[PDB]
Amino acid sequence: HHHHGSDLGRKLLEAARAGQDDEVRILMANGADVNAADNTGTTPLHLAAYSGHLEIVEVLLKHGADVDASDVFGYTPLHLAAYWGHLEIVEVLLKNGADVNAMDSDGMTPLHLAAKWGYKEIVEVLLKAGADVDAQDKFGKRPLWLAADQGHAEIAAKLVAARLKARVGYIELDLNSGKILESVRSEERFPMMSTFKVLLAGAILSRIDAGQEQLGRRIHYSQNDLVEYSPVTEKHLTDGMTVRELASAAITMSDNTAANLLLTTIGGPKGLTAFLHNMGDHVTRLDRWEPELNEAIPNDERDTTTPVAMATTLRKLLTGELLTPASRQQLMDWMEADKVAGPLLRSVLPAGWFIADKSGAGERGSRGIVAALGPDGKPSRIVVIYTTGSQATMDILNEAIAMLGRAMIEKW
Fold first, then answer.
1. Looking at the structure, do residues 68 and 139 belong to the same domain, yes or no?
2. Same domain (yes/no): 213, 228
3. CATH number of residue 389's parent domain
4. Range of the structural domain that residue 123 is part of
5. Catalytic amino acids?
6. Cα-based distances in Å from 20 to 47, 51, 320
7. Based on C-alpha coordinates, what's the Rg of the chain?
8. How far apart (Å, rounded) are the C-alpha atoms in residues 281 and 275?
């Protein structure tokens, strides 16, 4: 049944692979088959999408080429376009009704291919076309796993957003230069949650730099002050705690009472926001105290930041000139001793690496972390991740941050 060979169709395959678009059209007027297929089942549209000739793909589909033609390996021309990064061809193939979730022998959809090889724009197109983010390949792997394994953080950020069905903010800064290396929804507002405490530590460290506050100073409080999640301040009800101890509890244990006690020394949220304004952050804003700031009402701008605002502000505190060398080192050391961020970036940190971070959690599926990390004991990069709105469980959210972390760390 292979006897039905056609020199015209054979010539058309070659002209499609060889990019000869005028010859392809000549072979059209001499009656060649737009759906010719070699032994492997490859068609001119397959070869046009493989070699990346937009015009040849155009005319072949104009004349009724099978858009969803599958070769002997299950490859659609969309597979080949996604494998090689041909954005425009992916676009027309979907424009002409290609199957976005076409599966090959191994179960690989085109999203598996584009996500694995870092094709940022094609993923955006496949996603909007309804690519299945849960598609399992021959090995059960899903597209997001392949992205993280290959270190494509932006693609990964988009893929977890799909799974969370919620916005994900993501940005990466070079720790020394400040160059933005990656970004997703970097300018959109997200609830800060307890990640503000790292800013508070900066505001206090600035007043200690000025001599207006002492790490040794002791603050006495009462049972009337304790609030939700106050593990360190509820054990020193009578003897009290020092400013340093309270700041250590705020960062390393996310102690809500210690954070409020320290907020009063600078005039509450209004006072912290004034600090931020005067150092260049006219975006980040603290309005309420712990724990009300974690309410995360949709469209509420209270107690919110943006990934880019927080990231640059944090970089300025840690490497800028807002704090003395001792103070910026003390903030880093406090953050390195974080104890309540284990299931996030730390859960995928390879041995030998440094990380200093602070996490946050709130209502309506809000989860976020700010961090500086890097190989060989020194951090060389800042990462800020936020999400809100998801109704997934806190296990799923925690796993979400970890896969984003893996994606940054991998292929560093």
1. yes
2. yes
3. 3.40.710.10
4. 1-147
5. 194, 292
6. 12, 11, 57
7. 27
8. 9
